RNA sequence: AAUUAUAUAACUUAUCUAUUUUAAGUUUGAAAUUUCUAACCUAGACUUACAAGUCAAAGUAAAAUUGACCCAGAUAUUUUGAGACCAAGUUACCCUAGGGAUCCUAUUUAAGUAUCGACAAUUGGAUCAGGACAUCCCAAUUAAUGGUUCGUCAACGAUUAAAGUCCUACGUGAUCUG
């Protein structure tokens, strides 16, 4: 294992992964987890550095978590710099930081955690339409990567406004919250607008989604409710 | 508590006398057939395992 | 810190609030986070005590967003135990009614949130993982943002309430990925009684046989991708609400 | 509180009444309870509420991750079982026992022992940081050397060589009173 994190290159990598602004400046972020790293490789994400433990590297399981990065034995200090979190994972990868439609649009910068959770639900839901703001916010951070958990693995303002012009209604959802399959989120056009993780979604968020022309499906757990909706969304299709 | 290696079983006389005694055997081995002293007949006779009492 | 130094029950409430095991022992389900506290709060729970940092509980800033949860001092170590988020609002742990059941152990958030999902839809009784499984525990309920006993969604069900959930004459369906169609089931068409088995435990064969008494058909959600199955508890939540609407 | 509360009282069912086709439940509470095959035998010993179970000279006899008893089982008398029960307040209605009033400081050391005296050993801020090593940054298996920003039990944004994990009555500036 490589335990030397004091190198200038290691310090730059540590700064980018540890700090989101450094990640945006350096364009590099870290994904923690062998499953998450493997999903990144399938998605085509190009990893810059692969963090493998002294035992994980020998087992080659961390090597499979390269996510297109070069896999080399790494100790805690080296792994910590590669990983965006303080605690480095055994397998981690340092990578870059209509009619009856299912569309979710988020303008401006979005919380990296929210993006990962939303993307993970989207993979289960299988929505054919996705909307987002520019790439300013980095969703490759270890916290964001943890939110995706491999399930997650640039629409900008102009295209994002196009989704808003479309006549779609965002199905409401709440911890307490009509039925999930009784809402035409997939059966009818949907423009998912709810309180993001960066701002927080209260019971008003469910009402706000209802105000978008949708009905109820009180803050619901982002992972649990989104996963439940994704299963209902698949049934809707 | 979670660990479990041996088990306690009833060894019953094959002579029909009804005399039984308890013995410990490994869970992963076959049922025991043992020659043991049976007081009713006052001589050693074959004993065959019938039922498991508990996990040791 | 204990809610009241002399009051042992107050200390237990505070400890249970910020403690998955202690909450299960004390039958308390905490909703970590002020917004999640409101989640359990708006789901029909009036948390007697809320796990929050001693100083934070005194300030009661998350209590403002609890919207029912009663801010209570919580030890830092206890807060970590209940971590799934600071404001853990500890709370006590029909025909065509929404019915979710996260049978067996599963993701703490999935079980709690799935059970609560039925409550808002009009669930007469929503269910979660059994008392043995950690679903109503402070941390377990914390991720779900729901209370077991107080909210219709129950996790510290115990033996008595456990038959109660099944005992209703609502056709039941186990929903993981391919348990007819999630919303087009006999159970979904009839009163909702969805009971998804644990993700790592599955559905018991006896439970499948018991489904005959209910008359429901296990939930099968078509999946375009090759994923083996979706969140079991999450599937139950969708089936739970879906059944009520169809019924 | 914890557990209840066939004192009574009610309702329900009986009961008992009309027609005609008190008891048992439950609830109030008079209250109550508790707390805050791997032997047998036999000196001398172990373990133990009791009991059983152990070690062991001699003797005799076969051979060469629980642990007993009680207590419940099974069957026909043979076998099989793993000294505040649990449990909050309040008392100036009380009782008894008493205790009061009626950056220093104390040692040790002594760089600079008349008089002194470092280093040591025994609300937010501003200013300045000290310390732990389980090493983030800086540095050569070794090392705590100095540092580790500003904001919005988790998380995010922007910088920084880095924003380790933390401790030091907001770490640390000299209201006023009880």
Author numbering:
A (entry chain x): 95 to 191, 206 to 261, 268 to 291, 337 to 376, 385 to 404
B (entry chain 1): 10 to 65
C (entry chain y): 95 to 178, 183 to 191, 206 to 291, 337 to 404
Give the authors' words.
S-adenosylmethionine (SAM) is the principal methyl donor in cells and is essential for mitochondrial gene expression, influencing RNA modifications, translation, and ribosome biogenesis. Structural analysis by cryo-electron microscopy demonstrated that SAM-dependent methylation is required for peptidyl transferase centre formation during mitoribosome assembly. Our cryo-EM analysis of the mtLSU from SAM-depleted mitochondria reveals ten distinct assembly intermediates demonstrating how methylation can orchestrate mitoribosome maturation. During translation, peptide bond formation occurs in the PTC, predominantly formed by 16S rRNA during the late stages of mtLSU assembly and involves the folding and methylation of the A and P loops.
States A1-A4 are the earliest mtLSU assembly states identified here, characterised by an immature central protuberance (CP) and an A-loop of H92 held by an MRM3 dimer, which would typically methylate G2482. These states exhibit a relatively low overall resolution (4.6–7.4 Å) which is sufficient to trace CP maturation and the dissociation/recruitment of assembly factors and mitoribosomal proteins. Here, we observed four sub-states (A1-A4) with bound MRM3 dimer, which differ in (i) binding of uL16m (as A1/A3 mature to A2/A4) and bL36m (as A1/A2 mature into A3/A4) at the base of the L12 stalk and (ii) maturation status of the CP coupled with the dissociation of DDX28 (as A1/A2 mature to A3/A4). However, in states A2 and A4, the conformation of H89 correlated with the occupancy of uL16m, where H89 is lodged against uL16m proximal to a basic patch on its surface. It is thus likely that in the absence of uL16m (states A1/A3), H89 becomes disordered or displaced. In states A3/A4, DDX28 dissociated, allowing the recruitment of bL33m and the adoption of a more mature and structured CP. The MRM3 dimer remained bound to H92 in these states, but the weak density suggested that this was only a loose interaction. Early states (A1–A4) exhibit an immature CP with MRM3 dimers bound to H92, poised to methylate G2482.
